[PDB]
Design a protein around this ligand. Structure first.
Ligand code: MG
Ligand code: ZN
Lengths: 122, 69
């Protein structure tokens, strides 16, 4: 296999983390959405209370939809960066990344933008 | 040196208080994105007004607001 299994967003997240363009958490995400800061949106599928998820959806709807579901939060955190490095590969204290929103972007095009474009245009 | 006097009255700082975080935002029936209170005019949306009896302020401006809404 050579095709990305929804890895066209993890890379983006990583880049954002590198260049400090992340609205991580709910409040931050909301803030990013409300004005011209947040451009891409990722929410947890395993949201407790569901109210949070609903709010996120509402925010996405506002004017233009950036939301993509993917899978969970812990995995996202692992991909992007949560914990004090720890050894060669992973081994961090596993905690969820919550709702994650992209500011700045940093990196250009690649395989990253195609899936998003497809999602947008139906 | 002499002996320390100590007239008591020990004051501590403020430890934030964790609270329930967010409740001032609502979704009616999916699609209807609904706001509680009002947003700041000085700096763009994402900031809510602190609602009191004829007293309003915002946190990004730290304090600078006065008008009733
Ligand atoms: Mg003294
Ligand atoms: Zn303000």
């Amino acid at each position: 296999a050579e095709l990305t299994i929804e890895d066209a967003l993890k890379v983006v997240l990583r880049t954002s983390l590198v260049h400090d363009g992340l609205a991580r958490g709910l409040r931050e995400s909301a803030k990013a959405l409300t004005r011209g800061e947040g451009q891409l949106a990722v929410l947890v599928e395993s949201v407790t209370e569901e109210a949070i998820s609903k709010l996120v959806q509402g925010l996405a709807t506002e004017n233009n939809v950036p939301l993509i579901k993917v899978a969970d939060a812990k995995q996202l955190g692992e991909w992007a960066g949560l914990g004090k490095i720890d050894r060669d590969g992973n081994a961090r204290k596993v905690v969820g990344a919550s709702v994650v929103v992209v500011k700045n972007w940093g990196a250009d095009t690649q395989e990253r933008e195609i899936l998003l474009e497809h999602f947008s245009q139906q | 040196k002499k002996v320390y006097t100590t007239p008591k009255k020990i004051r501590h700082k403020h430890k934030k208080v964790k609270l329930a975080v967010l409740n001032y935002y609502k979704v009616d029936d999916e699609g209807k994105v609904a706001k509680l209170r009002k947003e700041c005019p000085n700096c763009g949306p994402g900031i809510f007004l602190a609602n009191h009896g004829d007293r309003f302020y915002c946190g990004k401006c730290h304090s600078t607001f006065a008008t009733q809404k």
